[PDB]
Design a protein around this ligand. Structure first.
Ligand SMILES: C[C@@H]1c2cccc(C(N)=O)c2C(=O)N1C1CCN(C2CCCCC2)CC1
Length: 348
């Protein structure tokens, strides 16, 4: 049996849950009878990405309906969908194409998790849980719920829930301290930057195998450029609930995982409105999209020399902005050191 503490064992089981992967696929409207979990491949997935890129361009540039039809058929022949009774939606609007891009990002992470699960179980000595754990190449510890550390994170959760995000309250079930192999080393130069902040990143549970094993990643050149409010990078929030939203929990499935990462933001190219950044201005290290509401700066604290904006949310006096709440973007994967993973209970 495993010598990993119960919470960590539970975590590993959650991350590698096969039923979760299938449910994710079903929700994406994939036909699991024609495309089962065990048939997902990296190559076939990458290919869908090019079709979506092409059809997005066609729509954007006013190509022919038949170009669009032709591309739509190719996508669906490659990735079989089940629309049940309904007629298959064509790939002729950008909102839908972006939804499909999102699906592909999730499928890739699911392929990663499934391949890891099914590989390298050769050692009959070690408990399967520990074998799977080790595949995450991440040192994980339970943070004691009655430590100053735990106390600070709990407050960050408590205080920074948004007003408009009132469908649920949020309880911290468990806090893991995590350290991905080689990440400290990768991050080390950015310790020289100022304005290092501890920020939220939410994703579906089914992404965590890829995230822990591979770190947070920036979208391929191959993926359409159209859906990203501030270009392709890694996005974080200072309001717990704006990130928690991206867990895709439900009353039916109320348990999610969310990250806190130290993010080396340096000098922030502050923005109000959409813009596809490809290069950052002179001596800027990150982007901040400014929001109408943000934690009160007067409450911000320091955890291990990283800023924790755990104040209750207040008006920022900025109105000429689209966003309701802040978000922060970096453009180099090395500018992130993940610090904690929280198991969250969404009380709807
Ligand atoms: C931007 C926003 C954000 C802000 C702050 C924190 C987060 C976070 N995960 O915590 C997130 C987050 O996830 N966001 C998504 C980014 C990807 N798009 C999609 C657009 C179309 C192409 C596929 C991607 C949908 C919204």
């Amino acid at each position: 049996k495993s010598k990993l503490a119960k919470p960590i064992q539970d975590l590993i089981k959650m991350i590698f849950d096969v039923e979760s992967m299938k449910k994710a696929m079903v929700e994406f409207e994939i036909d699991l009878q024609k495309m089962p979990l065990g048939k997902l491949s990296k190559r076939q997935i990458q290919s869908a990405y090019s079709i979506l890129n092409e059809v997005q361009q066609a729509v954007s540039d006013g190509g022919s309906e038949s170009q669009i039809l032709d591309l739509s058929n190719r996508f669906y022949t490659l990735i079989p969908h089940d629309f049940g009774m309904k007629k298959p939606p064509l790939l002729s609007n950008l909102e839908y194409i972006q939804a499909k891009v999102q699906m592909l990002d999730n499928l890739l992470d699911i392929e990663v998790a499934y391949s890891l699960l099914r590989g390298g179980n050769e050692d009959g000595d070690k408990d399967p849980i520990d074998i799977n754990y080790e595949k995450l190449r991440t040192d994980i510890k339970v943070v004691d719920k009655d430590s100053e550390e735990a106390k600070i994170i709990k407050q960050y959760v408590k205080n920074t829930h948004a007003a408009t995000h009132n469908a649920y309250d949020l309880k911290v079930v468990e806090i893991f301290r995590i350290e991905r192999e080689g990440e400290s080393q990768r991050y080390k130069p950015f310790k020289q930057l100022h304005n290092r902040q501890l920020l939220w990143h939410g994703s579906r549970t089914t992404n965590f195998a890829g995230i822990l094993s591979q770190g947070l990643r920036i979208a391929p050149p191959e993926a359409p450029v159209t859906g990203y409010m501030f270009g392709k990078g890694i996005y974080f929030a200072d309001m717990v609930s704006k990130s928690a939203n991206y867990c895709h929990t439900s009353q039916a499935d109320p348990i999610g995982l969310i990250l806190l990462g130290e993010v080396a933001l340096g000098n922030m190219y502050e923005l109000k409105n959409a813009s596809h950044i490809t290069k950052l201005p002179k001596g800027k290290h990150s982007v901040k999209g400014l929001g109408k509401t943000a934690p009160d700066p007067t409450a911000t604290t320091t955890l291990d020399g990283v800023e924790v904006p755990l104040g209750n949310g207040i008006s920022t006096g900025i109105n000429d902005t689209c966003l309701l709440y802040n978000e922060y973007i970096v453009y180099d994967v090395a500018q992130v050191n993940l610090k904690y993973l929280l198991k969250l209970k969404f009380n709807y």
